[PDB]
Design a protein around this ligand. Sequence first.
Ligand code: CLA
Ligand code: CLA
Ligand code: CLA
Ligand code: CLA
Ligand code: CLA
Ligand SMILES: CCCCCCCCCCCCCCCC(=O)OC[C@H](COP(=O)(O)OC[C@@H](O)CO)OC(=O)CCCCCCCCCCCCCCC
Ligand SMILES: CCCCCCCCCCCCCCCC(=O)OC[C@H](COP(=O)(O)OC[C@@H](O)CO)OC(=O)CCCCCCCCCCCCCCC
Ligand SMILES: CC1=C(/C=C/C(C)=C\C=C\C(C)=C\C=C\C=C(C)\C=C\C=C(C)\C=C\C2=C(C)CCCC2(C)C)C(C)(C)CCC1
Ligand SMILES: CC1=C(C/C=C(\C)CCC[C@H](C)CCC[C@H](C)CCCC(C)C)C(=O)c2ccccc2C1=O
Ligand code: SF4
Ligand SMILES: [Ca+2]
Ligand SMILES: [Cl-]
Lengths: 81, 141, 157, 31, 78, 40, 38, 751, 72
Amino acid sequence: MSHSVKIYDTCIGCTQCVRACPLDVLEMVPWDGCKAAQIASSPRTEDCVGCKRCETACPTDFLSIRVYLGAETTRSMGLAY
Amino acid sequence: MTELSGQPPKFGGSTGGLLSKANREEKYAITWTSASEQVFEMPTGGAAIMNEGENLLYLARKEQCLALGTQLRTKFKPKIQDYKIYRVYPSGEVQYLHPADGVFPEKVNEGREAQGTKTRRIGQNPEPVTIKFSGKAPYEV
Amino acid sequence: MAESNQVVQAYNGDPFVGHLSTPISDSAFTRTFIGNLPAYRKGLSPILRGLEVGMAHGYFLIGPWTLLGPLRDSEYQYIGGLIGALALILVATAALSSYGLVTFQGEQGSGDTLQTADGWSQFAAGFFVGGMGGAFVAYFLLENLSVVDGIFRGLFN
Amino acid sequence: MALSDTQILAALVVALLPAFLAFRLSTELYK
Amino acid sequence: AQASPTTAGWSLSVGIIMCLCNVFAFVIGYFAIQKTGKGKDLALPQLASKKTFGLPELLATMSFGHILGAGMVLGLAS
Amino acid sequence: MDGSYAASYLPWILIPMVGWLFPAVTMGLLFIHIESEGEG
Amino acid sequence: MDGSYAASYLPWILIPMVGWLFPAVTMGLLFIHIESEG
Amino acid sequence: MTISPPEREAKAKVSVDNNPVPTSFEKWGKPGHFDRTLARGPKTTTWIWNLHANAHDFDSQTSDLEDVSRKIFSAHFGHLAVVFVWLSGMYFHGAKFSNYEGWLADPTHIKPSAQVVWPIVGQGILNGDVGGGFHGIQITSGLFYLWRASGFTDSYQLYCTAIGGLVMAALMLFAGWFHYHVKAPKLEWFQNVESMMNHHLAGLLGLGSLGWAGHQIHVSMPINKLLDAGVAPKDIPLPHEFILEPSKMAELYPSFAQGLTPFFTLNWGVYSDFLTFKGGLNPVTGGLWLSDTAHHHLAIAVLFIIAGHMYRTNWGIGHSMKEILEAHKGPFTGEGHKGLYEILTTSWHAQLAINLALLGSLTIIVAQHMYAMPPYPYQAIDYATQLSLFTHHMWIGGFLIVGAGAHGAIFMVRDYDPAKNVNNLLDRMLRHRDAIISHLNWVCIFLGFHSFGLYIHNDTMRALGRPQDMFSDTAIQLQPIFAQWVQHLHTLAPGATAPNALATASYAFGGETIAVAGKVAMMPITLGTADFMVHHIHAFTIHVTALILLKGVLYARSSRLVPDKANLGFRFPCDGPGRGGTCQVSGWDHVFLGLFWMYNSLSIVIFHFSWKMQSDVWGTVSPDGSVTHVTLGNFAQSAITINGWLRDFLWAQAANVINSYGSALSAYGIMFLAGHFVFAFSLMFLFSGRGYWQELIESIVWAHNKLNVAPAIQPRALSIIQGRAVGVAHYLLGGIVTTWAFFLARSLSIG
Amino acid sequence: FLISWRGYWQELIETIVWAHERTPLANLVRWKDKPVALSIVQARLVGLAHFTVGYVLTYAAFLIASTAGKFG
Ligand code: CLA
Ligand code: CLA
Ligand code: CLA
Ligand code: CLA
Ligand code: CLA
Ligand SMILES: CCCCCCCCCCCCCCCC(=O)OC[C@H](COP(=O)(O)OC[C@@H](O)CO)OC(=O)CCCCCCCCCCCCCCC
Ligand SMILES: CCCCCCCCCCCCCCCC(=O)OC[C@H](COP(=O)(O)OC[C@@H](O)CO)OC(=O)CCCCCCCCCCCCCCC
Ligand SMILES: CC1=C(/C=C/C(C)=C\C=C\C(C)=C\C=C\C=C(C)\C=C\C=C(C)\C=C\C2=C(C)CCCC2(C)C)C(C)(C)CCC1
Ligand SMILES: CC1=C(C/C=C(\C)CCC[C@H](C)CCC[C@H](C)CCCC(C)C)C(=O)c2ccccc2C1=O
Ligand code: SF4
Ligand SMILES: [Ca+2]
Ligand SMILES: [Cl-]
């Protein structure tokens, strides 16, 4: 199920999305496309709820991290019951 | 993963805690080491008391454990950056979740494989008509 | 530490479970009362539990229409109440059986007999019979109220 | 006079209190 | 048909009722007041039981005595 | 409630059948169907 | 059986309750308690 | 270094800073200075709206609790200045633009009028003939009645009151300036809650009613006794002539012959000439007895002055509020009130929530008390004045209550410390808020089904031609048995449980039908099945408003959905479409929904009041005594169905507002249409979303770019929260203005 | 549905879910589908559907009844 979280090559490696994410969906991995030498990654999208905090945080001209809401699970619906 | 240790925080009880899901579906655990007995905000409402030494707490959701973790690492005199978060299944199986490779994700780390990476800009996604009658959306290709 | 005068403690000794042990939620009286209702009374097979629950419910379901339904001001007041109660118990039996049909498709647990397909069908059967009988017996009491009064007053001695 | 109809079924509510307290005392003495 | 008030204060309303209520209020105040002697203004030479433990205690318990006494007078006055 | 049209005994039982039996049965079938957890 | 005193409907149902329901309930509870555990 | 007085510490608990904030006009020319985020510069039009949204948010402006307290103190001064200007304008318009003396000479055959419209574009039609050749707008504030009760006679007295009100406003303004800029009290000064409370109970409330009792005994009562006897206002001596001639006071009240000796010697009974306890209403004017009110204010002065002594300040005797709080803790509540004294002395939003709740409740109490115990002369004759004051105080109370919920939530977000609240009342309520809110939800559903559901059942039964199956006094009766019993107890109080009371406290509980002039002043207000149903509707709507607002407060910190909501703030749109969508989780949004529901509740309350008073109370009495009510006693059979309320209440009584054109009440029909318009307008903001409007602004901005007229402050659509604020504000304004026009036109047209 | 948006209802439904899971006798029964608040789009659509049904039925009843009672 889960949502989809894509990271595009306009990433500047500021990591603000990872710090904003309240469910630990994102990581920083080494890259060579930007000065910061790091790119955001979404290795745990099965826990992603889709609150869009990462997108709120992204500074690049139109987001370099994009959350497309998809199939809804109890983890993705933020359910505690 | 193995067994989890730690003392339950001093607390009298809330209505905001675990429900039938915890036994039927899944649960989450957060462990942390505290320097003293100090009061902290319970993510399910109320104030609880963490004990000096090890503390294990069971919560209903991963986001609740992560909110407690941010509170531990941001609101305490000696900061607590020691908490570990696990997913607990009713079969007794425990799954280590956070922090993945022993390092917080905000900072880079070697041996991490990029996932969700797209080798193009947003404006370089294909047109939906070029992919209709497949099952894919322009970000999935 | 000479401080446990508190009556509201953690539910079942687990303060992190979404519940609180209170004089209503977990006191000796409420526990021994609800636990010995036909729904939870140990040593009871599902059909007997359903029989008891249905008896109670069908007995008391006569009143509302009997005293307030449209037939209350006719010569068929008790018959109208009875008919309403029987239809209500039939719809409730259909609901019970449908619930059982949908909730117990998968693997049959081994905890309690009531929480299985067979057990729930037995509970529904018991409920149907007990409810129809309780409604009919409360109807029969109301229709023969004079003999009940004469009995409890010794009028027939 | 004669006791009021409403008066007779008013002492029973007050009797509910010693009933509760006797229940509590019995359960405590059983301990 | 109103409440009649003794008609004149003379000897009955005063002393026999008012002073007694003030005295018994002073007793209950000396018995039950917590901070007995620590007001901004202190009391003159103690001696008896009037300014023995602070002007504040004395004034407060005399106010309460007049409350008790007014109640007593108006009540017994019918 | 009556009817002078032909076969006026038909609404007598069809109105309960359309208002009570038809909805009860169709809702029950759709209920057991949407809750069916047979794989697929 | 009748009663010119007020609430004469109260003994009507209260005599069976004190004589049938209450004794049956207390005796059943005490019987279950006597024969408990095993 | 402005004007420096000596000291004025008086060896007290006073502690001020001599001159912390200097006076200057430069920060006037820099709009947005109080917020760091706005002092930079407006880049988008959002900056503009924010400039108004955070103006009084002193917490987000500075972190010094002392500076916030000083700001609040000086703003209180400025607010009192504004209210003084308003009241002085009221007295000035009564002095120089009202027919107060002509009304005083013949109150029955004239209508209270102030404010003369200037004859232009045809608006001169609004100067309707109110009596005695006077043409203007009829006022429903009831200022003339308060003035006759006070003892006013000449316009020059009202003009002196207006001049004094302007001077008092200047005083309050200067005091605010002086106490924020010059001598600014330290934080330690505001935290003397025992001192403040002793003073407010003793000096503010007690001395106020003491001085007003003095004025009523010396000025109000004698002038009103001479007016009720018909001595005419031109022949009654000035108020001071009764102080200069104590014989004139003894001739009206012989008790004044014996002097102050009954007071000092406790011989109070002889004071029966002006200290009375009659209970009912004045037969000549229909208001309360001014001697009863003087005695009332006297006893209230006594009680409040006495109460101003419980708390401890500098002299040892008194009470420590922290002690009384910490003492109260039981086996159900752990530590009870341990920590409440600390939050009620360092958090402004806590005091504000408590005070808003109690003040709104008190204003509702004021409406419900002033309608049935009309305290002013000739008030009950004017059904427009009565209805207007009732609905106004109702609305004020409801708004204050919604604000109370708001600031409870704000406290929870901003000033809640879990270390300072461990196993106390607040902690345990947060620990079982799920239980609380779930049960309140169930009670709300039960009330909705068992109040409005009764109306729906009655509509369906009546439509089917089955009146015998309805809920009504003539079918399935739902008698308000307890309220009827309490009414009967009230009726029997004088002479029995109230020996020294001559009449009942309010004739709405029962008794004779007091009637002044052709109209009925006040009569018994019977209660039946319709009253039962309306009252349980009131219960339902009040419980739903409480549910919304209490849920907003209890979950402002967190929920199972949003566990870190406290970090998001009091006021924020959402936390994303994820988790299924999290729109309106903030405390602010709960206030936003509670606004609509309070509007719903109070609309029903005022509709109930209007219809019940027009059906079963107000009307015309005959020389025989026959009472023909305004709408002919139609409440019992019509107010039991919704169609009855739509037809016999709304549709029927709306006939005056719609036919008001070409007459003096035409502005009321105009404002009627205007309120409908603004209500409809609000639905655009409430039903839509910011994204569409911003995208449309994109094309409009492109058209501006095409002709090079694009503004540097970029147009941005209203923010989500702002969209809702605009929506709710216009909804409330439109609906309330509609019913304001409806009520005023209907009540002024029925004579 | 149009005015009041979703998160407030999801929290209320969570309180109701807790109320059910802790009420004995009712605890014997459990939902086959987890109760949740209506989605955002679903809310818009359901609110519009009520708006439109009420719109059309109100005006139809008015038009028909007025023209029939007056007979043109
Ligand atoms: C709007 C709701 C509503 C309405 C209108 C009614 C209406 C009515 N109810 Mg009901 N009820 C309701 C809700 C309602 N109820 C609810 C919510 C409950 C709780 C679940 C009950 C439970 C209840 C009970 C238990 C009974 C009623 C009964 C009645 C009827 C009593 C009036 C009468 O006919 O006098 C006559 C009343 C009697 C003759 C009492 C019956 C006396 C029998 C013989 C018992 C004797 C006691 C003793 C233990 C004997 C047991 C023998 C055993 C040892 C073998 C009446 C028509 C009574 C009834 O159905 O009449 C038969 C009755 O027994 N109600
Ligand atoms: C779609 C057309 C249509 C509609 C809207 C109605 C409407 C109605 N009919 Mg009628 N009926 C119809 C066709 C229709 N009829 C036809 C063709 C026949 C001859 C076979 C009948 C024979 C019939 C009888 C004998 C009676 C009614 C009666 C009624 C009334 C009560 C409902 C009922 O009991 O129906 C019952 C209907 C049937 C037993 C026959 C089925 C009707 C058609 C063939 C099926 C319609 C399927 C429909 C197109 C599916 C689309 C649904 C959509 C929401 C997806 C109701 C106002 C009762 C009455 O007169 O009230 C006083 C009554 O007793 N109908
Ligand atoms: C008996 C002494 C006394 C009195 C009269 C007041 C009165 C008042 N206080 Mg204050 N207060 C006092 C003691 C007193 N306080 C003390 C000792 C403290 C320290 C703990 C405080 C601290 C305190 C705070 C923090 C605040 C107040 C505020 C207020 C005002 C709010 C109530 C209101 O608006 O009603 C109606 C208002 C009026 C009727 C205004 C007329 C009253 C004038 C200004 C003063 C009276 C004149 C003077 C006594 C001489 C006239 C009487 C004489 C001729 C017989 C009010 C006028 C609030 C405020 O600032 O309001 C602006 C506020 O925030 N008080
Ligand atoms: C369930 C308990 C309860 C209830 C029912 C109330 C209700 C009320 N309180 Mg109270 N309060 C409580 C608990 C309670 N409070 C406790 C435990 C404390 C001790 C900390 C206080 C101390 C307090 C004070 C000091 C005052 C009130 C006042 C009031 C009244 C305000 C009316 C109003 O807003 O109109 C208009 C407002 C006024 C006429 C005066 C406004 C006074 C200021 C502006 C508010 C208080 C400032 C605050 C103490 C600043 C310090 C807090 C922090 C910054 C350190 C109101 C009816 C006020 C009052 O007048 O009492 C009669 C007031 O002076 N409360
Ligand atoms: C007429 C318009 C309307 C209606 C009917 C409702 C309905 C309701 N609102 Mg709501 N609301 C409205 C307007 C309306 N709202 C608007 C405009 C807003 C925006 C401000 C809100 C925002 C709002 C909030 C924030 C809240 C509510 C709440 C509630 C519920 C209160 C509980 C209750 O009353 O029990 C039930 C009552 C009813 C369901 C009314 C209809 C009952 C009829 C008479 C019986 C129907 C018979 C049968 C079922 C028919 C079946 C047909 C068959 C074919 C199956 C209730 C269901 C509160 C709540 O949830 O309380 C628990 C709550 O929190 N409303
Ligand atoms: C206001 C007073 C409150 C009391 C309730 C009043 C009416 C309600 C009756 C409900 C009872 C609940 C039944 C289930 C209670 C129940 O079955 O409990 C359970 C237990 C046997 O069941 P188990 O042990 O298997 O169940 C344990 C768990 O399932 C508990 O839930 O029975 C007993 O404990 C014995 C009963 C006590 C015997 C009491 C002695 C009484 C004799 C003395 C009487 C004196 C009378 C003097 C005055 C005349
Ligand atoms: C017609 C009135 C109908 C209500 C009667 C039934 C009451 C319902 C709840 C029973 C307990 C509350 C009464 C004891 C009052 C009481 O304080 O009991 C005592 C106990 C706490 O008392 P403590 O011993 O802790 O006292 C020390 C205090 O200083 C605590 O700070 O309260 C509780 O156990 C918590 C539950 C109260 C919350 C229950 C309220 C539920 C809302 C129901 C609203 C009904 C409307 C009333 C109309 C005005
Ligand atoms: C106890 C109690 C209570 C109360 C309750 C109520 C209010 C009620 C109930 C009541 C009821 C609910 C009763 C009942 C009755 C029933 C019956 C009595 C039954 C029956 C049946 C029979 C007898 C049989 C029949 C039949 C059959 C089945 C077979 C065939 C046919 C016939 C008909 C024969 C409470 C919880 C509060 C508390 C505690 C105690
Ligand atoms: C219409 C609309 C807009 C567009 C509205 C805008 C851009 C507001 C336009 C305001 C203009 C610029 C000012 C006109 C009103 C003045 C405030 C009135 C005072 C002017 C004085 C001269 C009197 C939104 O941005 C929006 C956002 C979220 C939910 C709903 C809506 C919504 O409905
Ligand atoms: S916020 Fe955007 S630019 Fe910054 S690291 Fe994350 S994806 Fe890259
Ligand atoms: Ca009938
Ligand atoms: Cl009607």
